[PDB]
Amino acid sequence: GSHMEKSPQRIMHIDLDYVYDENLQQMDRNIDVLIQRVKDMQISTVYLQAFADPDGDGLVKEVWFPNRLLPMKADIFSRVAWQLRTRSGVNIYAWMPVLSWDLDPTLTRVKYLPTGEKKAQIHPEQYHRLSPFDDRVRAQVGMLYEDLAGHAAFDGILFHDDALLSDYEDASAPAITAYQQAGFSGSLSEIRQNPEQFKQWARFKSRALTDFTLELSARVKAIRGPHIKTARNIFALPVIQPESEAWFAQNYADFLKSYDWTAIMAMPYLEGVAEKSADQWLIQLTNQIKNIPQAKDKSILELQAQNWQKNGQHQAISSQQLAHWMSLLQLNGVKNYGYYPDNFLHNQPEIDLIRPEFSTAWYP
Numbered sequence: 077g078s079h080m081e082k083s084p085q086r087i088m089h090i091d092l093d094y095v096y097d098e099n100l101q102q103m104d105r106n107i108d109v110l111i112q113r114v115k116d117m118q119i120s121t122v123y124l125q126a127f128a129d130p131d132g133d134g135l136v137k138e139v140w141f142p143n144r145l146l147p148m149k150a151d152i153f154s155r156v157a158w159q160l161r162t163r164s165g166v167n168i169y170a171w172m173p174v175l176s177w178d179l180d181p182t183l184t185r186v187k188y189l190p191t192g193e194k195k196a197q198i199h200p201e202q203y204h205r206l207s208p209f210d211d212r213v214r215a216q217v218g219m220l221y222e223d224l225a226g227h228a229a230f231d232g233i234l235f236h237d238d239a240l241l242s243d244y245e246d247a248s249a250p251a252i253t254a255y256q257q258a259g260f261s262g263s264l265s266e267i268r269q270n271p272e273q274f275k276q277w278a279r280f281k282s283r284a285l286t287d288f289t290l291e292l293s294a295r296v297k298a299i300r301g302p303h304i305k306t307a308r309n310i311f312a313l314p315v316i317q318p319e320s321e322a323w324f325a326q327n328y329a330d331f332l333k334s335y336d337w338t339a340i341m342a343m344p345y346l347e348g349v350a351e352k353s354a355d356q357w358l359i360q361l362t363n364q365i366k367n368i369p370q371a372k373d374k375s376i377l378e379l380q381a382q383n384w385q386k387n388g389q390h391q392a393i394s395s396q397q398l399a400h401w402m403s404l405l406q407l408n409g410v411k412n413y414g415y416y417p418d419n420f421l422h423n424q425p426e427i428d429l430i431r432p433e434f435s436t437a438w439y440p
């Protein structure tokens with residue numbers, strides 16, 4: 077069976093880390109408040125965190141659903157999902173990491189080759205990703221997605237933005253083997269700097285990530301049904317500067333063909349854009365999108381509602397600023413959009429302030 081999605085898409089991207097409370101009665105009230113908040117927002121879709129992320133340290137150690145391989149911090153994904161689907165009027169996408177799982181140490185990790193060093197290493201300021209070139213990684217991540225699919229009912233999958241590789245990655249042994257078997261000549265350095273192979277190499281890696289996600293969605297669809305929608309977060313640079321695929325292994329046209337929804341992280345401050353230049357940056361982004369026929373109809377522009385800091389103390393973005401950006405998108409012909417993150421505990425962003433620009437059901 078199939079499942080239609082009413083135009084336009086308006087998305088809340090929601091973490092469960094602060095919904096969780098070790099006091100069961102408090103967690104009950106938290107969930108009730110969250111369900112009511114999404115209901116009142118009157119939008120179309122929630123991208124719902126299925127994994128725990130208490131530290132923001134780029135590695136999933138625990139999840140919100142029972143499963144074979146990782147600790148379950150609390151059984152709350154299915155509980156929140158079915159109530160959002162029936163009380164709050166939204167489709168639910170299970171938001172899952174693709175690679176950043178704290179599994180068996182013998183499983184291959186993604187590594188990069190540091191300039192001037194012989195041995196590959198793990199990049200300190202990147203997601204702690206397992207290698208998609210390790211068959212056992214593919215198997216075990218497959219088991220996690222199947223465990224999710226078997227325990228919970230939902231409408232789609234959002235594949236995490238951790239499915240990325242730089243131009244010095246993946247330097248792990250299984251990755252080297254894969255390149256060699258795919259006909260690439262020499263070391264990673266020689267490939268990376270080979271005029272006749274470096275672009276083909278970037279595309280090989282982009283496709284390997286994409287094919288891996290499609291393996292996962294097939295496994296979920298086998299259990300839940302064919303109606304399950306797919307979405308994947310894409311970084312903005314591969315959209316506005318496609319040569320940057322070389323150090324993201326993400327390709328916008330590929331996403332548009334492969335997934336139901338391409339969730340662009342339309343986040344200027346994340347990309348280092350000055351406050352006074354953010355609107356123009358977003359305008360340029362929408363221009364690039366509109367220049368690709370039908371791209372906007374399969375893309376979601378995900379705005380940021382926090383300004384993340386290296387030292388961990390993230391700075392909020394005002395509801396006014398967020399509503400302003402939503403209006404900017406609308407006025408530039410983009411109707412599918414959303415934001416991350418949400419904070420029910422402080423009504424941030426403020427329901428009453430963003431609904432006019434966010435909810436299609438809103439009236440004066």
Ligand SMILES: N[C@@H]1[C@@H](O)[C@H](O)[C@@H](CO)O[C@H]1O
Pocket residue numbers: 242243244323
């Ligand atoms: N523009 C640079 C690339 O030139 C470089 O190769 C890459 C390395 O990861 O990072 C980018 O910021």
Ligand SMILES: N[C@@H]1[C@@H](O)[C@H](O)[C@@H](CO)O[C@H]1O
Pocket residue numbers: 311313346347
């Ligand atoms: N912090 C990420 C990096 O992955 C990347 O270096 C940067 C440049 O595009 O975009 C950000 O979202």
Ligand SMILES: N[C@@H]1[C@@H](O)[C@H](O)[C@@H](CO)O[C@H]1O
Pocket residue numbers: 237341384416
């Ligand atoms: N910089 C972090 C990353 O986890 C991610 O790339 C992005 C998601 O929206 O923003 C923050 O959460």
